[PDB]
Write a protein that binds this ligand. Structure first.
Ligand SMILES: [Mg+2]
Ligand SMILES: [Mg+2]
Ligand SMILES: [Mg+2]
Ligand SMILES: [Mg+2]
Ligand SMILES: [Mg+2]
Ligand SMILES: [Mg+2]
Ligand SMILES: [Mg+2]
Ligand SMILES: [Mg+2]
Ligand SMILES: [Mg+2]
Ligand SMILES: [Mg+2]
Ligand SMILES: [Mg+2]
Ligand SMILES: [Mg+2]
Ligand SMILES: [Mg+2]
Ligand SMILES: [Mg+2]
Ligand SMILES: [Mg+2]
Ligand SMILES: [Mg+2]
Ligand SMILES: [Mg+2]
Ligand SMILES: [Mg+2]
Ligand SMILES: [Mg+2]
Ligand SMILES: [Mg+2]
Ligand SMILES: [Mg+2]
Ligand SMILES: [Mg+2]
Ligand SMILES: [Mg+2]
Ligand SMILES: [Mg+2]
Ligand SMILES: [Mg+2]
Ligand SMILES: [Mg+2]
Ligand SMILES: [Mg+2]
Ligand SMILES: [Mg+2]
Ligand SMILES: [Mg+2]
Ligand SMILES: [Mg+2]
Ligand SMILES: [Mg+2]
Ligand SMILES: [Mg+2]
Ligand SMILES: [Mg+2]
Lengths: 52, 53, 187, 147, 53, 125
RNA sequence: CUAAGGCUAAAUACCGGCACGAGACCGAUAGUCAACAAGUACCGUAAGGGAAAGUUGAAAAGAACUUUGAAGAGAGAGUUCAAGAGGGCGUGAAACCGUUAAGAGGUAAACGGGUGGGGUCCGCGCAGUCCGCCCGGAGGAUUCAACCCGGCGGCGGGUCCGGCCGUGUCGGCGGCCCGGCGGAUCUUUCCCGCGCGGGGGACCGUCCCCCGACCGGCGACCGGCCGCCGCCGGGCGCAUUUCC
RNA sequence: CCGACCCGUCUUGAAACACGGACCAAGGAGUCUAACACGUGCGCGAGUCGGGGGCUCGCACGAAAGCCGCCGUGGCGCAAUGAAGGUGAAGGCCGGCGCGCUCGCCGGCCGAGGUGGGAUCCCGAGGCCUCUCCAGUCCGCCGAGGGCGCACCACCGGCCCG
RNA sequence: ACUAAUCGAACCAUCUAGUAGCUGGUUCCCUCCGAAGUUUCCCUCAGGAUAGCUGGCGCUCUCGCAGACCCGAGCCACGCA
RNA sequence: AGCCCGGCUCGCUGGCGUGGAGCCGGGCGUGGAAUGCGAGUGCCUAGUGGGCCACUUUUGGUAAGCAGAACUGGCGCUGCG
RNA sequence: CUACGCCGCGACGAGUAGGAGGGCCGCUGCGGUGAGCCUUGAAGCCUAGGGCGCGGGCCCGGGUGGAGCCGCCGCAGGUGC
C-alpha cells in the first residue's frame, strides 16, 4: 500500500499549466484539434450573460 | 559494498520496520472529521467565540 | 579489412535541445536558419548554446553583467546571455543596459527597466541584429555549482582540497583519522 | 514508469546485465559499511578520511537555541529596509541616518563581508565583527548594541 | 491571474508568466527585410555524384 | 501564431491518423489531406479548401477571410462552382493566383477539384 | 518545583466485530486456503496439515414415437437460431491418437543455400491499360468572350473618416467624503489610553478609469468610403464562340 | 548437389564418455519503500518549498482541484573555521605629513587585483564594383594589423578561521 | 540402542521468505560501441575494495563552411604520435 | 612560453654599477627535421580481477599436452579460405 | 518543406561479458481522441489462402464462434520464456 501513489506539484507550475490551458482554449485551431465541433460558434472565447 | 565516491549512509532499517508503517490514506478523512467537529462545536456554543477563551 | 578504430567515430554533442519547450524549439528553428544562411559565428555559438542543458547554461547575475558591460569599448552594445538573468541585491546602482536573455527574473527585470534599460527576447535580437553585430556575448559562471567542489582528486589524497560527501558537518563527522597527525596521518 | 527502465531491455539476456562469471550474488563483501577497516579500507581512506576515531570534547544535552546566532553581511545589510528608506536617506539634506534593526529582520550578528554605500546608517545588532564595525564607521555610521 | 502589468489581486503573490519569444511568427521574422539583407544566397543546385569515367 | 499552433498540434490532434507507416490529417480545409504545416487547414491565417457540393455535381471552394480569425461562425466564405471542368479549374486558378491568396496551394487545389469532378461524373460501362 | 495519596473529556490507535461506500487491483493454476454442501473431503494417536471443484439453453422446449440389442450403446424421428449447445453440456488450442487424401522411404530423423518436379490455391490472366493536348469525321446543348445589375472576398490608400493600439508628455479638474493597493517614508504639533498607545492625515511607489494633445502604425485589433482585381448569381449575348 | 554434431550452462577449452532437458499448455524471476550521488527536463530564482494545519454545498467524479501569507514555524541554500572558548571573508591609484622608518592620521576617486591563453564582439590601413574617365556623393564583402575580452585553465598576488 | 516406518537429540507450529563469498535459472527485435583475468590492500587464495581496461552524457576549441551553374586568387590550423 | 635590446623592483646574494629572480616596454615570422593525424577537458559508470596458446628470450625439472616469467600477436570474444 | 521534414556527398559495418539508442515491436489497465468497429456478427481459435517488414511482428481472405473490441496522443505496470 505504500507505493507513493501521490505526487506533489509546485504551485507556480500548476498555475502555469492553468494559464496555458486557458490561453489554448481561445485558439480555434487547438479546440478543433481537440475535436469539439466549433464551426458555428460565433466567437471562440464564448461569453454569455449572467442570466445563465 | 562501497562503490567509488559516495556518502557513508546509515539506514535505520534493521529493526523489522514493515510491521510498523503508518500510512496516511485517512488524512483527508481526518481533515473532514476535524472540520465537522469544529463546526458542530461552534454551533453548540452559538454566540461564544468558536476558537475558545 | 581496414586498420582503423571505431571507438571515436560518433561525436557526442547536442544536435538539438533535449527540451520539448515549443517556444525554445521555434527560436532554435530561427537560429538554425540564421546560422546556416549567415557567416556570423555569433549565430553558431548562440545556436549551440540553445542546444545546451540547464547546468551548461548557468544563470548570469546582474552584478556580473554590469561588471562585464562596464569594460572599456562596450558602450551601447547589447549584452546577450543564453540563459537567465538573475537579480543581484549586492549592487546598488544599475546603469542603462540593453540586454537580450532567454529568461529574466521579475525583480531583475524591474530593476533593469527602472534604470531605463531595454530587455529583448532572442527573436527581437534576431530582428535587431541578425548577424549579432554590436553584441557582448556573456555567460554565467559554468563551474559555480556545488558539484564542482566535490569533483577533482579524491579527498583522502595528498594536496587535494575537494569537499567530501558527508551527511552532517561537525567534529564527529570525518575529522579524526586521515585528517590530523594526532590520529594516524593527515596528508 | 517501469517501461523506461533497463529491465525491459534486459529481457532475453540470461545474466540480466550482471555477468556470467561473477554473477549477482546476495552480499559479496558484507552488508552495509562492513569491513571499512579491513577489506574496504582503500575506499574508506580514499573518499572518507577522518572517518575512524574520536576528536574533541563531548558535550551532553546540547541545546541549539543557546548557540542560535544568525549572521548578515554588510553587502546584504541594506536589503533589510525598504528602497524608500535608502533613497530618502541618500537624498536627505540633513545628515539624518536611518536605523537598521537586524534583530528585527532576524539576524543577531553583523559580519563585514563586502562594502557599504557611502552614506551614514545606524545599525542595531547583538554582536558586531571588528571589520563590520570599521566599515560602518568608515561611511560615517554608528554601531549600537542590543540585548 | 493578473495582467502582465498587475499582479493577481486574488492570489497575493502571483503574476502572469513571461514569454521567452515575443513574436512567434517565424514566417514574418524570416521574411523581414532586415533578416533578408544579412543572408547569403541560397545554394539550390543539387550536385549528385559524378560517375568516374 | 501558425508556427506555434503547429508545434502544438503536429503530433497531438484528433484529425491525425498514423497507420501503415503513413500519416494523414482529416481537418476540413486540408488539400492533399496530409499532416504538414503547409497544408494544415486550421493553423493558417488564410486557408483554401475544395469540397464536393451537397448534390453530386460541382465543387465548393471555401476560403478563410482575414478579419474574423477567432470567430469560426463567419470565418469561412464558400462559393459553389458548377461549370465545366476547364471553367472550374480556371475559376480556382484565378481565385488563388490573381488574389495572391496562398499561391503555394494552387496546384493542390486544382488537382483536388479535378479529382472531385472526375469522381462526380457518371461511371462508364 | 513541592515527591513518597486520588480522579478527569477532547484531539490519538484499531489486520477482531456489526453495517456500509469505493477502487488506474485480481479475474477461476489469478484473487483469501475457500467465487462451489471449504477450514469441507481427506491425512495424522495427537498437536496439527488441508485440497480439487464456476459456465447447456432466451426458455427444459432436457429428445415423444418407431427400430436392433439383455443392456451399455446405436439408426431414424423430434425441440431449438444452434445439440457440428444433449445434464461435468459456452468457446474448444497444443502434446498425443484414429481414419481419409497426396507424396516419399537401405546411410536415424531434422536443418541451411540452390534449383527442379508435382499439388492446393490466387490473379474477373486469357487478345491486354490509361489520360493531357491537337487533327479529322459525324451529333447535341446551354450559352463562349465582352458588357449591365446585385452579392461576396483579396489587396492598397496621405488616416482618405472613425475606432483605436504601443511608448513616452503635459495640467492633475480629476481619489483616502467623490476610484484602489502597498511603503522599515514623515506626523496630533486638529482625535478617545500616561509628558507614554490606537486612529485620522501628508508624502512616496505602483495604480485606476478620465478630460485631451504630440510620436510610430493600421499592425497579424477592426469598421465606413474610394481604387484595382477575383469569384458567384441573374440578364443580354443563340453561333467560324463555348461545352458534352 | 553442396554445406551441416544438441541446445542451455560453468569453463582456458563442450558435440562431449560434464550437468539439466520425454512431450505440450498455463504460471515463472532486478520489484516497491527509504537514503544518497550524478546526469537530464520543468518552475521560480538569493531565494525556494506548504509536504503538517486551516478555509472553501463535506462526498458522482471530488480521498480531487482551489486558496492561505502575521499559517514560511521549519527544511535546504545564502559563511567559514577551531576540540573549544571564540573569531569570522575589499582592494587599486593620485597625494600632501611623522621619518610615506617597508609604516601610522585623512582627503579625492573607483569598486574584488594581475600575467598568459581565450569563443564572440569592436576599430581597421588597404582591396572587390558597372561603357571609360579628372570629381565626391550613400551604404555591402574581403582584409594585414590593433582593441575590449565571456566561460574555463595555468600561475602570481589579496582576504577569513586554526 | 529405543523413544509411533523419524534418533549422535522425536514430532508439530512459529520466529522464517533465517543466512549463503556456493550451485541452478533469469522471458521481445534491430542498431552502435565494446572488455578483463593485471597493480596495491584485505584471516584474502571459489570473495571484495582499489587502479587499469569499457560505455554513456557532454563541454571547450581548431580547418573552413564561399561564389545562385561555374570560378584559388616566402605564407598556408590549436595541438597530437 | 623562442631570440635579442633597453628599463624597474627585491627585505635574497654581495668588494663592485655583483649575482639571481621577478616585473615592464620594444624589435624580430625563412613557424627553424621527415611522415601522419583534428585536439583538449569533465562527470557518471558496468563487466572483469580462474585465463590459455604460438615464435623468440628464459627459471625449476630426465621430461611432460609439467610448473613459472619477459616481448608481441592470437584464442577466450572470431566467422571465412 | 510531417523543418522531429526533405535532399546531397564521403567513409565505414566481427563480437562474449557489458553499456547505450531506436522500436508505426508485443501484453494489460487509466485519462483523452477516432460523430472508431460490432448480432448484416466482437473476442478467441483453426487454415496447402494473399501479402508486408532485416526483425520483433502485423494486415487482409475462408471457416468456427456468439458479445464485446481496437487505432492514435499521453499515463501506469504483477508486461514478453
Ligand atoms: Mg568492411
Ligand atoms: Mg567494433
Ligand atoms: Mg550481450
Ligand atoms: Mg534461456
Ligand atoms: Mg586483518
Ligand atoms: Mg483458487
Ligand atoms: Mg479458463
Ligand atoms: Mg457396460
Ligand atoms: Mg453454433
Ligand atoms: Mg463444449
Ligand atoms: Mg491426421
Ligand atoms: Mg553448468
Ligand atoms: Mg575444467
Ligand atoms: Mg554446450
Ligand atoms: Mg569426451
Ligand atoms: Mg556422469
Ligand atoms: Mg554441476
Ligand atoms: Mg536427465
Ligand atoms: Mg522438467
Ligand atoms: Mg507463458
Ligand atoms: Mg488540497
Ligand atoms: Mg524562521
Ligand atoms: Mg583573464
Ligand atoms: Mg593565489
Ligand atoms: Mg529458506
Ligand atoms: Mg564456479
Ligand atoms: Mg571468479
Ligand atoms: Mg605454461
Ligand atoms: Mg570466459
Ligand atoms: Mg578482441
Ligand atoms: Mg578468427
Ligand atoms: Mg556490429
Ligand atoms: Mg512477472
Amino acid at each position: 500500500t505504500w507505493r507513493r501513489w501521490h505526487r506533489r506539484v509546485n504551485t507556480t507550475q500548476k498555475r502555469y499549466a492553468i494559464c496555458s490551458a486557458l490561453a489554448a482554449s481561445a485558439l480555434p485551431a487547438l479546440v478543433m484539434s481537440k475535436g469539439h465541433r466549433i464551426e458555428e460558434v460565433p466567437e471562440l472565447p464564448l461569453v454569455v450573460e449572467d442570466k445563465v | 559494498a562501497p562503490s567509488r565516491n559516495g556518502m557513508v549512509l546509515k539506514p535505520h532499517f534493521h529493526k523489522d520496520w514493515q510491521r510498523r508503517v503508518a500510512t496516511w490514506f485517512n488524512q483527508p478523512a481526518r481533515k473532514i472529521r476535524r472540520r465537522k467537529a469544529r463546526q458542530a462545536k461552534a454551533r453548540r456554543i452559538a454566540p461564544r467565540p468558536a476558537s475558545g477563551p | 579489412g581496414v586498420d582503423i578504430r571505431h571507438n571515436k567515430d560518433r561525436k557526442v554533442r547536442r544536435k538539438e535541445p533535449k527540451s520539448q519547450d515549443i517556444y525554445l524549439r521555434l527560436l532554435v528553428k530561427l537560429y538554425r536558419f540564421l546560422a546556416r544562411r549567415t557567416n556570423s559565428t555569433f549565430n553558431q555559438v548562440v545556436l549551440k548554446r540553445l542546444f545546451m542543458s540547464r547546468t551548461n547554461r548557468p544563470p548570469l547575475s546582474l552584478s556580473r553583467m554590469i561588471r562585464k558591460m562596464k569594460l572599456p569599448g562596450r558602450e551601447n552594445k547589447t549584452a546577450v546571455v543564453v540563459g537567465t538573468i538573475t537579480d543581484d541585491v549586492r549592487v546598488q546602482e544599475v546603469p542603462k543596459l540593453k540586454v537580450c536573455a532567454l529568461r529574466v527574473t521579475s525583480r531583475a527585470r524591474s530593476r533593469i527597466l527602472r534604470a531605463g534599460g531595454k530587455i529583448l527576447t532572442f527573436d527581437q535580437l534576431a530582428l535587431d541584429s541578425p548577424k549579432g553585430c554590436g553584441t557582448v556575448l556573456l555567460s554565467g559562471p559554468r563551474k559555480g555549482r556545488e558539484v564542482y567542489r566535490h569533483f577533482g582528486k579524491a579527498p583522502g589524497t595528498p594536496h587535494s582540497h575537494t569537499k567530501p560527501y558527508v551527511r552532517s558537518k561537525g567534529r564527529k563527522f570525518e575529522r579524526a583519522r586521515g585528517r590530523r597527525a594526532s590520529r594516524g596521518y593527515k596528508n | 514508469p517501469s517501461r523506461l527502465r533497463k529491465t525491459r531491455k534486459l529481457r532475453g539476456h540470461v545474466s540480466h546485465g550482471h555477468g556470467r562469471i561473477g554473477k549477482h550474488r546476495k552480499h559479496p563483501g558484507g552488508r552495509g559499511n562492513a569491513g571499512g577497516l579491513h577489506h574496504h579500507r582503500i575506499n574508506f581512506d580514499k573518499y572518507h578520511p577522518g572517518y575512524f576515531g574520536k576528536v574533541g570534547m563531548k558535550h551532553y544535552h546540547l541545546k541549539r537555541n543557546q548557540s542560535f546566532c544568525p549572521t548578515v553581511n554588510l553587502d546584504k545589510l541594506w536589503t533589510l529596509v525598504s528602497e524608500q528608506t535608502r533613497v530618502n536617506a541618500a537624498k536627505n539634506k540633513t545628515g539624518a541616518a536611518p536605523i537598521i534593526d537586524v534583530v528585527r529582520s532576524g539576524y543577531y550578528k553583523v559580519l563585514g563581508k563586502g562594502k557599504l554605500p557611502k552614506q551614514p546608517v545606524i545599525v542595531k545588532a547583538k554582536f558586531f565583527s571588528r571589520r563590520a564595525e570599521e566599515k560602518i564607521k568608515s561611511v560615517g555610521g554608528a554601531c549600537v548594541l542590543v540585548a | 491571474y493578473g495582467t502582465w502589468r498587475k499582479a493577481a489581486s486574488l492570489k497575493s503573490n502571483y503574476n502572469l508568466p513571461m514569454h521567452k519569444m515575443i513574436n512567434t511568427d517565424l514566417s514574418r521574422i524570416l521574411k523581414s527585410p532586415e533578416i533578408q539583407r544579412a543572408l547569403r544566397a541560397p545554394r539550390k543546385k543539387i550536385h549528385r555524384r559524378v560517375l568516374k569515367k | 501564431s501558425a508556427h506555434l499552433q503547429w508545434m502544438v498540434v503536429r503530433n497531438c490532434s484528433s484529425f491525425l491518423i498514423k497507420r501503415n507507416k503513413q500519416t494523414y490529417s482529416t481537418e476540413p480545409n486540408n488539400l492533399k489531406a496530409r499532416n504538414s504545416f503547409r497544408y494544415n487547414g486550421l493553423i493558417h491565417r488564410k486557408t483554401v479548401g475544395v469540397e464536393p457540393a451537397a448534390d453530386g455535381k460541382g465543387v465548393v471552394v471555401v476560403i478563410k477571410r482575414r478579419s474574423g480569425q477567432r470567430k469560426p461562425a463567419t470565418s469561412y466564405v464558400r462559393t459553389t462552382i458548377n461549370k465545366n471542368a476547364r471553367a472550374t479549374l480556371s475559376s480556382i486558378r484565378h481565385m488563388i493566383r490573381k488574389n495572391k491568396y496562398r499561391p503555394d496551394l494552387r496546384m493542390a487545389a486544382i488537382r483536388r477539384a479535378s479529382a472531385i469532378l472526375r469522381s462526380q461524373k457518371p461511371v462508364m460501362v
